[PDB]
Amino acid sequence: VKNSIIWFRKGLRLHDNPALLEACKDAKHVYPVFVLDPHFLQQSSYKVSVNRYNFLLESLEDLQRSFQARGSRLLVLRGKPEEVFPRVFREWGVTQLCFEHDTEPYAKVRDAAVRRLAAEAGVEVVTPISHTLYDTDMLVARNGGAAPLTMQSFTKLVDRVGDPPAPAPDPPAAMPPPAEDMPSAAPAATGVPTWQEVGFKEPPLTVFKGGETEALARLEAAFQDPKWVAGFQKPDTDPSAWEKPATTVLSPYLKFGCLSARLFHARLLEVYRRHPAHSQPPVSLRGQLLWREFFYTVGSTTPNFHRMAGNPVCKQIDWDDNPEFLAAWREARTGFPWIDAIMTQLVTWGWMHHLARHSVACFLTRGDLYVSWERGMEVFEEHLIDQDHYLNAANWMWLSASAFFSQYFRVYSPVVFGKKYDPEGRFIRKFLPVLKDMPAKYIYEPWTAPLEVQRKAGCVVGRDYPAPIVDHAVASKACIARMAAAYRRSK
Numbered sequence: 433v434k435n436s437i438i439w440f441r442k443g444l445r446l447h448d449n450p451a452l453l454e455a456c457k458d459a460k461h462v463y464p465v466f467v468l469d470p471h472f473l474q475q476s477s478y479k480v481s482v483n484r485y486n487f488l489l490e491s492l493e494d495l496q497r498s499f500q501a502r503g504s505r506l507l508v509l510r511g512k513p514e515e516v517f518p519r520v521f522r523e524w525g526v527t528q529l530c531f532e533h534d535t536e537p538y539a540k541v542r543d544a545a546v547r548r549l550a551a552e553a554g555v556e557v558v559t560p561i562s563h564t565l566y567d568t569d570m571l572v573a574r575n576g577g578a579a580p581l582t583m584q585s586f587t588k589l590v591d592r593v594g595d596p597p598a599p600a601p602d603p604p605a606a607m608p609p610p611a612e613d614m615p616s617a618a619p620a621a622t623g624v625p626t627w628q629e630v631g632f633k634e635p636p637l638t639v640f641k642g643g644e645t646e647a648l649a650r651l652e653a654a655f656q657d658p659k660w661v662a663g664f665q666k667p668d669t670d671p672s673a674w675e676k677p678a679t680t681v682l683s684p685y686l687k688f689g690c691l692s693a694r695l696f697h698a699r700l701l702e703v704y705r706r707h708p709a710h711s712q713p714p715v716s717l718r719g720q721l722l723w724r725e726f727f728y729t730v731g732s733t734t735p736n737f738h739r740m741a742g743n744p745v746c747k748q749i750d751w752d753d754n755p756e757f758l759a760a761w762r763e764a765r766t767g768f769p770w771i772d773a774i775m776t777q778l779v780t781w782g783w784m785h786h787l788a789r790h791s792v793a794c795f796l797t798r799g800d801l802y803v804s805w806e807r808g809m810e811v812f813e814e815h816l817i818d819q820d821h822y823l824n825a826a827n828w829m830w831l832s833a834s835a836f837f838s839q840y841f842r843v844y845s846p847v848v849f850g851k852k853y854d855p856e857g858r859f860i861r862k863f864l865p866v867l868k869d870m871p872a873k874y875i876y877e878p879w880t881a882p883l884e885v886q887r888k889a890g891c892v893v894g895r896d897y898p899a900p901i902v903d904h905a906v907a908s909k910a911c912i913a914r915m916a917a918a919y920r921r922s923k
């Protein structure tokens with residue numbers, strides 16, 4: 433008799449889930465499992481806000497509903513996978529364990545340990561690729577055994593390899609449930625908890641809801657305008673747009689696997705077929721999925737990718753240990769409203785537009801404050817709802833000119849950058865209410881408002897909103913000087 437586990441970690445969906453499909457095939461009982469793992473709650477190492485963790489819980493609640501609707505049940509097991517799984521293998525008479533492959537450092541250690549244990553229990557292990565467009569090992573293999581290090585040569589590689597696989601079909605309308613009266617499957621030990629019960633003190637404030645149903649809705653909303661999809665150009669999109677964000681906001685759903693990257697890609701290709709002037713990579717929407725694939729592919733084959741030291745793709749730079757600069761940045765009190773509004777969005781929504789992530793990451797690292805990208809990445813690791821190990825590392829290295837990108841003379845202005853999109857400062861008025869009534873003339877530079885104007889707007893620099901912590905002209909020149917010297921020490 434076939435008794436199977438479908439183990440969810442990412443891949444939090446029923447659509448495009450070949451793992452799930454294999455688990456159901458010829459099965460008497462299927463046990464859908466997510467292991468609520470203490471590794472992600474020990475705030476010592478690994479950081480997570482209530483925003484992200486509650487987005488996860490919402491996604492698990494949506495899975496529960498999808499499984500309940502098909503005659504089954506999601507089991508949220510508490511514990512370390514190494515010690516939970518041997519128990520349930522025996523208790524449930526498990527013959528097959530299915531899960532979606534992942535390539536992160538923790539995933540590799542965890543997944544090796546669970547395979548060894550599975551083999552000891554006589555349990556078959558089935559691990560299809562479906563978090564990424566392609567099997568990332570296959571790509572490296574086809575490229576002659578190393579990952580390409582530019583987006584251009586990565587794009588050429590995948591064009592030679594061909595289209596990603598189709599989304600797998602939808603799973604059956606009825607699924608075999610867990611067997612009755614299994615003690616590790618007791619409802620009360622296996623329900624989706626709340627953020628309160630997991631132990632978060634403060635409520636989540638983000639406006640984006642977790643789960644596959646929300647992911648599919650947001651995918652559908654995006655594809656209701658095929659000209660927009662066809663003509664999408666990432667660098668030409670507006671980072672100050674918040675009522676209707678200028679990009680898809682599909683990142684947290686792709687991060688958790690509430691949305692299938694292959695579904696998204698197949699949908700793009702349908703549109704591109706009927707729209708022959710469609711944008712091409714890297715700026716196109718397909719280009720965006722390829723950035724993701726690119727950084728996963730490089731990231732999974734490089735040791736210490738998420739660090740500077742011991743990381744072969746990363747420049748060793750003499751970053752300042754400057755806790756007050758980092759704290760001002762982290763706590764949204766740099767005195768540059770563009771920067772502080774974005775850092776407020778980070779902590780409220782857990783999502784900003786890519787170019788707002790550029791402004792704040794450039795400002796922290798190579799642009800003004802010369803703090804290590806690792807400090808920035810950690811702050812993003814806590815607050816981003818789309819926090820992705822490889823994508824966050826790679827973009828921080830890109831923005832600090834530590835890897836992939838070397839043009840350290842290009843520095844974004846914390847005053848001018850947003851102003852060319854949003855001269856009235858609508859974005860700033862949203863995320864920093866204290867500047868609601870400041871005239872647009874002064875909103876990017878409130879320290880240049882006459883004192884009469886500051887008082888009239890109820891926002892006096894130094895009292896209600898802080899003075900700027902640097903002079904951008906002085907800070908950037910110094911930072912460019914230090915970057916030049918670090919590059920010359922490297923050669």
Ligand SMILES: Cc1cc2nc3c(=O)[nH]c(=O)nc-3n(C[C@H](O)[C@H](O)[C@H](O)COP(=O)(O)OP(=O)(O)OC[C@H]3O[C@@H](n4cnc5c(N)ncnc54)[C@H](O)[C@@H]3O)c2cc1C
Nearest residue numbers: 679680681682683720721723724786789818819820824827
């Ligand atoms: C300092 C810094 C840190 C970042 N950290 C993260 C992170 O932790 N997680 C994360 O998903 N993205 C990260 N990004 C990339 C990018 O900013 C987000 O993926 C994007 O803003 C998400 O919005 P969207 O879903 O509307 O993307 P769209 O423009 O709609 O693109 C669709 C999808 O493509 C992928 N994608 C888009 N841009 C990029 C990119 N530059 N690199 C890799 N993949 C991309 C994402 O999965 C995204 O959902 C970071 C960028 C910077 C500059």
Ligand SMILES: O=c1nc2n(C[C@@H](O)[C@H](O)[C@@H](O)CO)c3cc(O)ccc3cc-2c(=O)[nH]1
Nearest residue numbers: 441442467468469472480534536538539819
């Ligand atoms: O299997 C789990 N995956 C969790 N993941 C999912 C993955 O990151 C996955 O476990 C691994 O593939 C990462 O190495 C989380 C992701 C977040 O962004 C935030 C919190 C979690 C928590 C968990 C968890 O408790 N259990």
Ligand SMILES: [Cl-]
Nearest residue numbers: 510625629630
């Ligand atoms: Cl709990």
